[PDB]
Ligand binder design. Sequence first.
Ligand SMILES: O=C(COc1ccccc1P(=O)(O)O)NCc1ccccc1
Ligand SMILES: O=C(COc1ccccc1P(=O)(O)O)NCc1ccccc1
Ligand SMILES: [Mg+2]
Ligand SMILES: [Mg+2]
Ligand SMILES: [Mg+2]
Ligand SMILES: [Mg+2]
Ligand SMILES: [Mg+2]
Ligand SMILES: [Mg+2]
Lengths: 236, 236
Amino acid sequence: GAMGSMERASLIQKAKLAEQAERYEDMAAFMKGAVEKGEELSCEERNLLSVAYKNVVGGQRAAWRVLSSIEQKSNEEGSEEKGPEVREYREKVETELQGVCDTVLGLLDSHLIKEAGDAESRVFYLKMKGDYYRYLAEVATGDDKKRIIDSARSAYQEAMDISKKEMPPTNPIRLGLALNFSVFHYEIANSPEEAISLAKTTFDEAMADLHTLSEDSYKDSTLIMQLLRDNLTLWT
Amino acid sequence: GAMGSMERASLIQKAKLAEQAERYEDMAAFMKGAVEKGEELSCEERNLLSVAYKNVVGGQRAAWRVLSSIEQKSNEEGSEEKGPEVREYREKVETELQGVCDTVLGLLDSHLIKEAGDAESRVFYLKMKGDYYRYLAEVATGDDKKRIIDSARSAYQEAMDISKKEMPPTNPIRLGLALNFSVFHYEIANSPEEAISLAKTTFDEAMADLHTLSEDSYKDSTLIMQLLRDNLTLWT
Ligand SMILES: O=C(COc1ccccc1P(=O)(O)O)NCc1ccccc1
Ligand SMILES: O=C(COc1ccccc1P(=O)(O)O)NCc1ccccc1
Ligand SMILES: [Mg+2]
Ligand SMILES: [Mg+2]
Ligand SMILES: [Mg+2]
Ligand SMILES: [Mg+2]
Ligand SMILES: [Mg+2]
Ligand SMILES: [Mg+2]
């Protein structure tokens, strides 16, 4: 552990500085170090962890998509062969992406999830587990892919079950979970009808609970409701 | 050398793929490997080297500026102390930036510059040498800073002398060199009058040579002339 000699609070402070500097690889390493101190994470600290790795893996996913599309064009009728380079480099990026996902999943399994007893922390971590298996699924091929997809589905489902019992329908954690599980259904599981039904039921049940919220909470919830509606517009 | 086992042509191909994927750290490592094969670089290959390291160091400069400004606020009248973290992290980024600059300068010195006999390659490499000493100067403090500034000035000046003898006034390499040397004068050397005079003389002498150019070359030259005029507007 390269961050083993740095104070937990210093790691959190530096993660925040790295976010400001848009240094997301540094931010992720600092938050990994904070997690490995072994104490539970606060709401703010959980969000820092999520922001850091979402940005890192997002860059890798974008690059992998560019490279995979070049690779697929290179393996089409009428292409003159270029040799192994495109495949090799896509494999390099893919391997780096898988390693980031494995790192996050390792943090959740050792030992964030098992110590998370409150609904807000447990749903948050289980949503993350679903997300990073979903990113693994995006680059997986074969039976391989089926066990990874089922791991994503299981994590999302446990998170959904808890959120429906323990959180109101406008809770932003609950809404963001349903948003991402709906994307899983549409993009990974080949279940567009399940995706649309989940996004619609989630939107409608939040709409009916908005009257209970303050102005600030209303803004938080309607923001994510708009993302659900954007997807339904794209999907229907 | 981690790229010692990869073919030169494969390194160039992968640099181009990395550019497409906006993976500039990879692009720079691939081009470093290509340079270390020991053969001279073509015009296209020189541009790939420059693009890669400009993007890498640009990210570091942007982050260093964010962190240094936070550090300066933290050391002002009325700030409550936060401890060593801001300084430590700015120093980390600074050290990483200096290492990238040192790497580029090492490639130029071993042995790109000494083998560059044509005006287009020699001016290109000497401009690069001025640029990466200028980036070192931006974070340097003290006497330290004076020797680094003089190294930047010397490189830019040798490049200017060659470009004035060997290239027409609209040559994009010559124009980009004059642009960057003018920025050196304004931002590093505390010589705004020298900056303005150089940018104005460079613009006016290119304007008078535009009639000699094709439509495509006219577009290339006027693009950089606009950058010179943008700076003069900012500076006067
Ligand atoms: O189509 C997508 C999906 O985005 C969404 C949308 C809604 C919820 C979650 C995600 P997700 O957790 O990010 O998938 N693209 C995102 C992307 C892809 C490549 C690089 C960077 C970002
Ligand atoms: O003020 C500048 C100077 O830009 C110019 C302008 C004209 C010529 C060269 C440069 P330069 O070789 O890039 O300095 N900002 C650039 C920057 C700073 C931080 C991060 C990324 C980019
Ligand atoms: Mg301690
Ligand atoms: Mg693979
Ligand atoms: Mg249902
Ligand atoms: Mg060979
Ligand atoms: Mg220093
Ligand atoms: Mg003069």
